[model samples]
Target: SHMCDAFVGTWKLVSSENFDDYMKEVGVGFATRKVAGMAKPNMIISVNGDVITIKSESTFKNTEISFILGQEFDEVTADDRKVKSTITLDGGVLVHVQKWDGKSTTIKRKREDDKLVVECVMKGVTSTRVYERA
Candidate 1:
């Protein structure tokens, strides 16, 4: 499979670890964080030419991001934060970085044994979210 092809599929969330803490680090309010913690988002990934599109769908809300690697784009995150986002291929993993205000967070998505593993990081807090092909 092509390196990028590994992530091009529909994935359903299986679990999330320390997501609340991670969200706190991102400055999400207590009420919103509680709701978000209970929601399981399905992620769909697609690539065309140099453009990569990722859609996150959930009961609460849906958000999609489409961009070319290495280029920054203005984005309004699902958490209602306006941010600058960029994505790049590092090894076989998709590295996503989002910056807002003076803070930044990184989300890394990698395929392993047919499952998609997402690592979210902010400051020293980290969360691991696992998804299976759907």
Candidate 2:
């Protein structure tokens, strides 16, 4: 469980930047991007049975993913891209990789000085979202 302890809490979004562009790179449509950009989301993270779960919530939609470290599994993206995803623990960071339709993305999550810092990257665009324990 390495650094899993750092991730076991509900988190409120404190800052988000360039998320819409990140969505665009992931193939999300215009209508969804418009609505998605309007949302202020929260994340709930927990671990059980050697597996970690991440739940994202908002007024518009909610999605959850549960995975064991270093295992590949089917994953449905927030915008409905059915893909294969793998999560690994790197120090205090949770590294997530998702692949779909010849494209892929990487998201790194780390607890920095008690704040959750998430970096989502696709192609050449990267979005950073920060959260506080809620």
Candidate 3:
């Protein structure tokens, strides 16, 4: 189905700035942080009801995160900070609203050139991460 296509696909992170910086702020080490900073992650999202399970695979690590749309849930931060993130979709775009410490981060994702591209804006800073098909 067309709707399934919107959520089911392999995505790889191509480029990300400010991600490393943000992780560093959370006390990530230099080498591990560097590895994660330079990581190209492959992500898969499977939707079931209001819940979506996401698998993120990278050269250094592989992790899974799940959430429900329009509902708040605890999300693990880059360096162990816990945050509440809500998931939603608009058209073919997947959006995530992350809340922590009285602040919020908005992340939007869309498919471009058979890849997933993401834009994250928060704390007066902005960054983009592109994901390629895996």
Candidate 4:
């Protein structure tokens, strides 16, 4: 849909803060976190019809997730957890919410000053990742 047009692009990681904590909270190992922290991940997002795909590429491991707005899907998280995920676009922000074992993890992505700002929150710990168009 045209609503996703603003998010269809290649974005390179510029800065990430507290990502390790988020990974740790989600049960990622030390070695994996170390490698994940060092790599500059690139997020490539695309939209076709009512489906949107988000691919996160890094030296350590690459992952892709596809979903339609307002639809719930089963997702396997990076740390190997199964969750129910739903993605929605609201007021220029792309919101992704995951629920697992009665807990919630929310990710919000929005553009600010031509850059992409992503906020990931899980278990009360919030991580911020900033990206630039690439």
Candidate 5:
């Protein structure tokens, strides 16, 4: 239950850096990228037995993904790309890997003090997002 206990809560995005580059690498368009870069998304995380759900909400677009730990599933990203996604929990860190169009993207989320630190890497571009509990 360590994963559930650590992530079952709502988190508000406080700050982000280099998200534009990350979105660009993911194939997001100009207007969509601009809107997404300026928006503050709220993440709603929940756990149901062995399943984990993360809902990201923003004015631009909302995306929700649900998967069991260590299981791979098909996922459509916020930018509307289809990918095979797998999420795994290691120690206190949650690592999500996505394979799409012969490319790989990795997102790592971990708790730092009372905040959640997310590192997103895609095609050599890395972005950092910090979220505080809502």
Candidate 6:
């Protein structure tokens, strides 16, 4: 199957690499994040040309995101911090911009073993997260 084709739909989160720690670092409240850590986050991705629509569906809440490649977009994290993002594709690599209050974070993504390996670098955080293909 084609790389993009396999991911051009919706997927349920079977598991997470570092569920609890990852959520904790994101500044989520211990109790809530703990429960969320155990959650299964289903994701739906709609790719229309260079634009992508995304939905992170969890048992507690459903988070939605829509973005265009190479364009700036805003994101509100679990900690309620607004971030600016610009997503783009460089060959097979997907890049992202995470703009915090006065800082900028970067993330890169690629496919491996049918999972999307995402590496993000920010203040005191250089982390990787994986999502399986839908």
| Each candidate structure's count of clashing pairs | 0, 0, 1, 0, 0, 0
Off by over 4 Å in 5: none
Name the regions of candidate 4 deviating beyond 4 angstroms.
Answer: none
lDDT value for model 5 = 0.91
Q: Tell how far residue 10 is off in model 3, in angstroms.
A: 1.7
TM-score of 6: 0.74
Q: What digit string (tens of lDDT, one per residue) describes model 5 on residues 14-116?
A: 9999999999888889988987788899999999888899999999789999999999999988888899999998887999999988989999999889999
Q: Each candidate: what lDDT?
A: 0.92, 0.90, 0.73, 0.88, 0.91, 0.68
Question: What's the TM-score of each model vs. the native?
Answer: 0.96, 0.94, 0.78, 0.91, 0.95, 0.74
Q: Write the candidate numbers in order of decreasing TM-score.
A: 1, 5, 2, 4, 3, 6
What is the C-alpha lDDT profile of model 3 across 1-134, one tens digit per residue?
44446657677676777786665444568888877777777888787765678888777777778876678888775445588888777877878887778767788888777767788776666677877776
Cα RMSDs of all predictions?
A: 1.0, 1.3, 2.7, 1.6, 1.1, 3.1
Candidate order, lDDT descending: 1, 5, 2, 4, 3, 6
What residue runs in model 6 are displaced by over 4 Å at the alpha carbon?
A: 1-6, 124-127
Better of 3 and 6 by lDDT: 3
lDDT of 2 at 43: 95
Candidate 1 lDDT over 17-132, as tens digits, reads 99999999999999999988999999999988888899999987799999999999988788989899988898888899999899999999998897999999999999999999
lDDT of 1 at 8: 92
- Model 2 residue 109 CA deviation (Å) reads 0.3
Identify the leading candidate in terms of lDDT.
1
lDDT per residue, candidate 2, 1-134, as tens digits? Answer: 44588789999998999999999888899999998888878999998869789999998789999888999999877778899999998876789999988888999999899899999999899999999999
Error of 4 at 44 (Å): 0.7
The superposed Cα distance between candidate 3 and the true structure at residue 120, in angstroms, equals: 1.4
